[PDB]
């Protein structure tokens, strides 16, 4: 997706992106799920 702001400050790094978006298909959602707190 790309950098995502949180509290003003921006991010840069998360999301290498080299080959296929394989790991970026399941491991991309996992986070979401785990994103409950």
GROMACS .gro file of N, CA and C in nm:
model
  111
    1UNK      N    1   0.083  -0.119   0.000
    1UNK     CA    2   0.000   0.000   0.000
    1UNK      C    3   0.087   0.126   0.000
    2UNK      N    4   0.173   0.134   0.101
    2UNK     CA    5   0.263   0.248   0.113
    2UNK      C    6   0.258   0.306   0.255
    3UNK      N    7   0.350   0.397   0.281
    3UNK     CA    8   0.357   0.461   0.411
    3UNK      C    9   0.216   0.496   0.458
    4UNK      N   10   0.199   0.495   0.590
    4UNK     CA   11   0.070   0.526   0.649
    4UNK      C   12   0.094   0.611   0.774
    5UNK      N   13   0.041   0.732   0.772
    5UNK     CA   14   0.056   0.823   0.884
    5UNK      C   15  -0.024   0.773   1.004
    6UNK      N   16   0.024   0.809   1.122
    6UNK     CA   17  -0.042   0.769   1.245
    6UNK      C   18  -0.083   0.891   1.328
    7UNK      N   19   0.017   0.966   1.370
    7UNK     CA   20  -0.007   1.085   1.450
    7UNK      C   21   0.079   1.200   1.396
    8UNK      N   22   0.058   1.231   1.269
    8UNK     CA   23   0.133   1.338   1.205
    8UNK      C   24   0.259   1.284   1.137
    9UNK      N   25   0.346   1.227   1.219
    9UNK     CA   26   0.470   1.172   1.168
    9UNK      C   27   0.439   1.063   1.065
   10UNK      N   28   0.520   1.060   0.961
   10UNK     CA   29   0.502   0.962   0.855
   10UNK      C   30   0.603   0.848   0.870
   11UNK      N   31   0.573   0.737   0.803
   11UNK     CA   32   0.660   0.621   0.808
   11UNK      C   33   0.727   0.597   0.672
   12UNK      N   34   0.833   0.517   0.675
   12UNK     CA   35   0.906   0.485   0.554
   12UNK      C   36   0.993   0.361   0.576
   13UNK      N   37   0.958   0.255   0.505
   13UNK     CA   38   1.031   0.130   0.516
   13UNK      C   39   0.938   0.010   0.502
   14UNK      N   40   0.852  -0.006   0.601
   14UNK     CA   41   0.757  -0.116   0.601
   14UNK      C   42   0.699  -0.139   0.461
   15UNK      N   43   0.731  -0.255   0.406
   15UNK     CA   44   0.684  -0.290   0.273
   15UNK      C   45   0.796  -0.280   0.170
   16UNK      N   46   0.881  -0.381   0.169
   16UNK     CA   47   0.993  -0.385   0.077
   16UNK      C   48   0.944  -0.384  -0.068
   17UNK      N   49   0.885  -0.496  -0.108
   17UNK     CA   50   0.834  -0.510  -0.243
   17UNK      C   51   0.947  -0.537  -0.342
   18UNK      N   52   0.963  -0.665  -0.376
   18UNK     CA   53   1.067  -0.705  -0.469
   18UNK      C   54   1.011  -0.797  -0.577
   19UNK      N   55   0.966  -0.914  -0.533
   19UNK     CA   56   0.910  -1.012  -0.624
   19UNK      C   57   0.757  -1.012  -0.617
   20UNK      N   58   0.701  -1.132  -0.628
   20UNK     CA   59   0.556  -1.147  -0.624
   20UNK      C   60   0.501  -1.099  -0.489
   21UNK      N   61   0.370  -1.074  -0.488
   21UNK     CA   62   0.304  -1.028  -0.368
   21UNK      C   63   0.243  -1.147  -0.293
   22UNK      N   64   0.318  -1.256  -0.291
   22UNK     CA   65   0.273  -1.377  -0.224
   22UNK      C   66   0.260  -1.349  -0.074
   23UNK      N   67   0.374  -1.327  -0.011
   23UNK     CA   68   0.377  -1.299   0.132
   23UNK      C   69   0.294  -1.174   0.160
   24UNK      N   70   0.277  -1.093   0.057
   24UNK     CA   71   0.201  -0.970   0.070
   24UNK      C   72   0.054  -0.995   0.036
   25UNK      N   73   0.008  -1.115   0.070
   25UNK     CA   74  -0.130  -1.153   0.044
   25UNK      C   75  -0.192  -1.208   0.172
   26UNK      N   76  -0.116  -1.294   0.239
   26UNK     CA   77  -0.163  -1.355   0.363
   26UNK      C   78  -0.103  -1.284   0.484
   27UNK      N   79   0.025  -1.252   0.473
   27UNK     CA   80   0.096  -1.184   0.581
   27UNK      C   81   0.057  -1.036   0.581
   28UNK      N   82  -0.020  -0.998   0.480
   28UNK     CA   83  -0.064  -0.860   0.468
   28UNK      C   84  -0.195  -0.842   0.546
   29UNK      N   85  -0.268  -0.951   0.559
   29UNK     CA   86  -0.395  -0.948   0.630
   29UNK      C   87  -0.374  -0.989   0.776
   30UNK      N   88  -0.292  -1.092   0.795
   30UNK     CA   89  -0.263  -1.141   0.928
   30UNK      C   90  -0.252  -1.023   1.025
   31UNK      N   91  -0.170  -0.926   0.986
   31UNK     CA   92  -0.150  -0.808   1.068
   31UNK      C   93  -0.286  -0.750   1.107
   32UNK      N   94  -0.368  -0.728   1.006
   32UNK     CA   95  -0.501  -0.672   1.028
   32UNK      C   96  -0.571  -0.748   1.141
   33UNK      N   97  -0.583  -0.878   1.123
   33UNK     CA   98  -0.648  -0.963   1.222
   33UNK      C   99  -0.584  -0.937   1.359
   34UNK      N  100  -0.452  -0.951   1.363
   34UNK     CA  101  -0.378  -0.930   1.486
   34UNK      C  102  -0.393  -0.785   1.535
   35UNK      N  103  -0.447  -0.702   1.447
   35UNK     CA  104  -0.467  -0.562   1.480
   35UNK      C  105  -0.603  -0.545   1.549
   36UNK      N  106  -0.609  -0.590   1.673
   36UNK     CA  107  -0.731  -0.581   1.751
   36UNK      C  108  -0.702  -0.510   1.883
   37UNK      N  109  -0.593  -0.551   1.946
   37UNK     CA  110  -0.553  -0.492   2.073
   37UNK      C  111  -0.646  -0.537   2.186
   0.00000   0.00000   0.00000
